[PDB]
Amino acid sequence: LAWLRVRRALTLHPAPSALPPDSSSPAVAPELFWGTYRPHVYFGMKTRSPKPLLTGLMWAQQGATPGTPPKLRHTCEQGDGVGPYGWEFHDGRTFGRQHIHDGALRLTTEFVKRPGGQHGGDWSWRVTVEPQASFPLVSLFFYVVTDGQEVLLPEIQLKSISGHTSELGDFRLTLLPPTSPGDTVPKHGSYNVFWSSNPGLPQLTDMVKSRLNSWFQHRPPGASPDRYLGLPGSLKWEESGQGQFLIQQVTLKAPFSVEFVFESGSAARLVGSQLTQALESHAAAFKERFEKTFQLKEKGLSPEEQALGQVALSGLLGGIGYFYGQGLVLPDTMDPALFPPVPLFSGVPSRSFFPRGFLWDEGFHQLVVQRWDPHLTREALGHWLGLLNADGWIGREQILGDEARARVPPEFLVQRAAHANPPTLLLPVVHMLEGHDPDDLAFLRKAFPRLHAWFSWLHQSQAGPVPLSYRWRGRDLALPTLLNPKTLPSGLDDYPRASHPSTAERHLDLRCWVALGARVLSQLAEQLGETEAAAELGPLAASLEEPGSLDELHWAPELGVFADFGNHTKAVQLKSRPPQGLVRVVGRPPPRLQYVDALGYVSLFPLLLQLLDPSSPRLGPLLDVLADSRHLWSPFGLRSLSASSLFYKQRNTEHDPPYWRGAVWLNINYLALGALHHYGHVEGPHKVQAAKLYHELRANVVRNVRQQYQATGFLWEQYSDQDGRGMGCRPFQGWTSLVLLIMAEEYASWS
Ligand SMILES: *[C@@H]1O[C@H](CO)[C@@H](O[C@@H]2O[C@H](CO)[C@@H](O)[C@H](O)[C@H]2NC(C)=O)[C@H](O)[C@H]1NC(C)=O
Ligand SMILES: COCCCCCCCCCN1C[C@H](O)[C@@H](O)[C@H](O)[C@H]1CO
Numbered sequence: 001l002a003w004l005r006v007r008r009a010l011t012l013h014p015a016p017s018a019l020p021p022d023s024s025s026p027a028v029a030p031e032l033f034w035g036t037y038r039p040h041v042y043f044g045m046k047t048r049s050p051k052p053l054l055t056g057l058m059w060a061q062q063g064a065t066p067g068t069p070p071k072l073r074h075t076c077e078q079g080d081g082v083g084p085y086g087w088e089f090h091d092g093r094t095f096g097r098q099h100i101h102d103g104a105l106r107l108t109t110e111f112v113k114r115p116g117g118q119h120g121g122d123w124s125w126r127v128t129v130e131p132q133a134s135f136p137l138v139s140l141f142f143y144v145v146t147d148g149q150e151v152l153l154p155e156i157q158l159k160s161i162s163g164h165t166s167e168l169g170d171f172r173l174t175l176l177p178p179t180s181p182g183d184t185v186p187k188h189g190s191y192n193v194f195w196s197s198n199p200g201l202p203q204l205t206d207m208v209k210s211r212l213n214s215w216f217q218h219r220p221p222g223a224s225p226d227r228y229l230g231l232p233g234s235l236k237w238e239e240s241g242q243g244q245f246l247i248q249q250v251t252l253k254a255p256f257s258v259e260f261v262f263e264s265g266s267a268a269r270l271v272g273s274q275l276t277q278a279l280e281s282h283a284a285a286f287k288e289r290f291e292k293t294f295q296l297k298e299k300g301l302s303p304e305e306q307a308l309g310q311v312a313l314s315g316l317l318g319g320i321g322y323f324y325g326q327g328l329v330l331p332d333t334m335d336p337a338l339f340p341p342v343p344l345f346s347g348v349p350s351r352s353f354f355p356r357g358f359l360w361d362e363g364f365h366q367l368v369v370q371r372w373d374p375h376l377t378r379e380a381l382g383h384w385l386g387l388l389n390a391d392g393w394i395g396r397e398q399i400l401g402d403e404a405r406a407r408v409p410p411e412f413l414v415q416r417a418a419h420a421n422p423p424t425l426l427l428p429v430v431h432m433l434e435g436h437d438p439d440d441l442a443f444l445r446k447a448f449p450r451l452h453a454w455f456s457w458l459h460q461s462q463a464g465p466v467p468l469s470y471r472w473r474g475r476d477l478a479l480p481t482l483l484n485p486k487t488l489p490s491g492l493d494d495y496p497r498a499s500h501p502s503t504a505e506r507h508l509d510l511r512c513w514v515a516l517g518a519r520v521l522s523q524l525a526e527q528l529g530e531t532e533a534a535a536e537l538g539p540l541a542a543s544l545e546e547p548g549s550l551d552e553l554h555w556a557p558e559l560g561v562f563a564d565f566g567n568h569t570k571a572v573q574l575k576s577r578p579p580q581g582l583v584r585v586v587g588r589p590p591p592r593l594q595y596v597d598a599l600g601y602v603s604l605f606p607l608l609l610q611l612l613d614p615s616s617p618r619l620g621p622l623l624d625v626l627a628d629s630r631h632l633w634s635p636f637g638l639r640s641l642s643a644s645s646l647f648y649k650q651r652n653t654e655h656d657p658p659y660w661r662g663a664v665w666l667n668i669n670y671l672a673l674g675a676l677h678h679y680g681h682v683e684g685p686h687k688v689q690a691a692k693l694y695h696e697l698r699a700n701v702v703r704n705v706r707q708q709y710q711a712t713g714f715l716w717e718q719y720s721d722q723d724g725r726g727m728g729c730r731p732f733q734g735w736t737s738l739v740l741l742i743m744a745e746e747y748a749s750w751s
Contacts, residue, residue, distance in 0.1 A: 008390045009329065009332065009389055009417045012340050012342070012389065013388035015449040015453060016449065018381070018382040018385040019383065019386065024049065026120040029379075030121065033048055034120050034123055035092075035322070037320065038321065040075050042109070043056065044056030046322060047167065048322045050324045053145070056143050057125075058074045058208060059073045059140050061105060061139075062136075063226075070212075072209055074208075078730075085100040086098060086318075086733075089286055090313075090315075090317045091282075091373075093373070095110075095112045097109075097110045105132065106131070106132055107128065107129055108126075109126075110127075110279060111126075112124055112279060116264065116266075117264045117266030117268075118169070120264070121267055122261075122263050122267050124271065125261075126275060126279075127257065128256070129255060129256055130181065131255065135254060136253070138251065138252070138254055139229075139230070142248045144173055145201070146198065146245075150165055151163070152195075152246055154235060157191070158235060159174070161246065169264070169266055170266075171262065172263045173263075174260070174261045174263070175260055176259040178257065179257055182276075188220045190217075190230075190251040191250060193247070193249065194211050194231040194249075196238035196245060197244060197245065198244060202407065207245070208247060211232075215227055215228070216230045293372060295744065296743060299743075304710075308705065308743075311715070312737040313737065315733035315737065316368055316734070317372070318733075322345055323344040325341055325399075328414040329395065329416075330415070330417060330418075332418035343386070345380055346365075347365035350732050354399070355401075356397060356399050357398035357400075359395075359396045359421040362425060363422070363423070365737070366427075366428040367427055367741060368737050368741060370431055374440060375439075377432075381443075385447055385450040385451070388453060391417070391457055392456055393417050393457055395415030396420070416474060419474040420472065420474075422490070423454070423455065423516075425454075426455075426516070430523075430750045431748040432444060434749070441527075448524065448528060448530060455517050458513075459517075459540075464506050465506070468543060470506070472507050474487070474488060475501045478501060481581075482653060483572060484496050485497070492602065493659050494658065494659045494660055495601065496661075497598065498591075499566075499569050499570075500567040500568065504567065506554065506565040507564055511544070512605040512606060512611060515609070516609045516750070518540045519541040519750060520750055522538045522541045525537055526538075550606065559597055562603060562618070563595040563596055563597070563603065564595070564602060565595055568593075568596050569590060572585070572586055573585050573587070582653070597645075598641065598645065599631055599642035599645060600632065601641075603622070603625065604622060604625075606622070607623075607672075608675050615685060619679070619686050623690065623693065626638065626693065627689075630642075634721035635700060635704075636704040636721060637666075637669045638668065638697070639662055640661065640664070640665055640668070641660065641661045665718050666719075670735070670741065672697065673697060673698060676694035677694050698742060701739070704724040705736070705739045708724065712726055715731055715737065716728060716736060717729040717732040
């Protein structure tokens with residue numbers, strides 16, 4: 001009855017899978033079985049499996065202040081003192097090179113994957129420790145974590161570790177003796193080791209910290225000895241069927257390099273000189289492929305801009321993760337419920353975040369990935385489409401497994417089945433259609449019922465008060481602490497909308513996403529021969545493209561822009577009231593139904609998504625507000641909100657700083673650049689002005705992102721509209737990677 005609808009919200013969609021039957025098994029995808037699929041860990045690997053084999057690195061500098069134990073490094077915590085760091089090279093498949101700056105130390109973490117056998121092949125790591133341009137004493141830790149009943153067989157001094165799993169068969173792990181960098185001659189190292197049952201992945205750091213409780217002596221030949229904190233000096237199992245954890249510690253004076261090798265039984269050497277040769281061959285092949293794909297040198301980009309592009313791509317491919325588990329869901333009508341267990345293969349917005357998937361970020365990530373490797377995009381889109389419930393909903397934030405949950409109470413992990421997110425997954429679909437590649441076409445043929453179910457859910461679940469209008473569900477519940485209720489499902493969290501939320505609201509950005517989605521899917525339906533779907537999608541796209549209805553619903557003549565509508569008053573302020581603290585004060589005039597004055601990214605949506613005809617009477621006015629220094633035009637790109645707005649740089653609460661209230665964001669700037677490139681290249685009365693603004697905006701965005709990367713070593717979440725400085729989270733790779741597509745002038749066109 002009502003309980004049948006609840007189970008529907010918590011059931012996987014019955015349509016055919018967009019991915020082959022056992023898509024992640026090494027029999028089907030051998031090249032992708034192993035990888036750097038744990039983005040929140042500085043350096044580690046895992047298999048694309050629900051019961052994976054995990055590896056990782058930890059490090060600590062010895063000679064630290066007493067009473068105060070050394071800082072142990074393992075996960076990418078934004079305030080741990082490490083930085084800058086990031087991938088210089090990573091092709092998302094065979095190799096990678098990363099640099100980590102940590103106080104007096106510089107670390108180089110490199111890997112090469114070698115195919116062979118029936119279980120996903122082999123891999124080798126090289127970790128180089130050098131002093132910052134001092135011979136500091138350093139401990140490196142190399143661990144392995146098994147699943148359930150799987151056991152490890154050591155080879156004692158600790159030479160190697162052998163194992164067996166259903167998915168990997170027989171395998172061997174070897175920690176080779178250290179050498180000096182660029183040489184094969186062995187150097188003396190001190191060894192410690194810990195071995196017991198796996199305490200859980202978010203508990204590895206604390207378990208190691210707890211067992212670094214006894215002093216030892218590093219005794220190299222021809223040198224004075226050094227004291228260090230370590231794990232037990234000899235191998236002894238410590239006393240539940242939750243898998244095993246074995247961590248090996250190596251300590252000596254920098255500079256040195258140490259190799260950690262994985263060898264598959266079925267594949268039966270990638271070490272020293274052969275590993276050095278493999279690394280150089282991979283780096284050269286990467287550079288050749290990068291120029292052919294993006295043609296930056298041919299397009300006249302500087303060597304510095306070329307280096308920026310290379311890092312933009314490497315950081316994005318380096319942040320691709322594999323997740324498995326049950327998410328928390330709140331059905332629309334109630335208590336939270338578990339969703340069925342599912343896998344997810346996806347890019348992440350920041351390595352500094354708990355390892356999670358974000359729905360509208362992924363559409364932007366895949367625009368970059370598809371240009372480099374179309375197969376990776378098919379894998380990622382196929383996995384996101386596997387998350388649909390029987391109604392066509394996908395949770396906007398995917399928190400799957402223990403590390404992703406990261407000790408946050410379940411109350412803050414729950415995804416609401418009533419709430420949406422922009423359908424940016426359709427943007428890489430436009431490019432796949434344009435290229436007419438047979439593999440992309442065969443994938444889209446299989447994926448069509450899922451893409452259609454998901455789109456249909458969006459315009460039906462978010463229907464507005466009148467025909468052809470839409471309203472984002474999930475605006476914050478009006479509280480005395482909130483200046484303006486946020487719209488978290490829209491992606492632009494604190495962009496100002498109506499002061500007093502109600503069911504009479506009409507949202508401009510959402511209407512525009514629906515118009516684009518209907519157009520993209522009608523084009524796909526026509527290409528595939530989906531007659532009945534095309535007969536529905538075609539007329540819906542035309543009804544939403546139409547200028548009369550858009551004008552009636554969103555054109556605000558008193559504002560000279562397109563706007564959101566609702567019960568609103570500009571007379572709202574945050575004021576301190578003892579004993580209350582800082583609270584919102586509604587003054588005069590009282591709220592009434594009208595268009596909302598909030599000139600910014602939302603105002604531009606018919607232009608950004610290329611919905612206006614080149615001869616539209618509304619195109620000129622939008623171009624003028626975009627170009628105006630008093631509004632959106634800053635020397636570093638387009639502002640999220642007008643500098644003349646009463647909400648400009650305004651905090652929403654005592655604990656909530658401005659977010660989409662002035663700062664420059666690279667995803668929306670990329671869409672504006674695609675739109676200006678479009679209007680500047682088609683015939684029309686504003687072609688000249690659009691072509692000019694395109695060149696000026698491109699120059700400003702590229703320059704600032706390049707300069708901030710030079711000054712900080714990072715690509716940031718957002719940029720200051722006043723001085724261009726990187727702000728928010730970092731590394732943000734992440735849609736800030738779109739800077740590569742801006743430099744290459746690669747924009748997907750849906751006309
Ligand atoms: C716009 O918002 C105002 C402010 O909340 C609404 O006024 C409230 O209306 C309800 C229902 O009549 C009353 O119980 C409250 O006392 C009113 N509050 C105040 C402070 O006047 C108003 O109804 C809303 N208008 C529309 C069209 O939704
Ligand atoms: C310590 O790790 C914390 C991990 C979880 C953070 C959860 C909050 C996500 C904030 C980041 N970000 C806010 C933007 O306004 C959205 O448009 C965007 O989709 C989203 C994801 O990039």
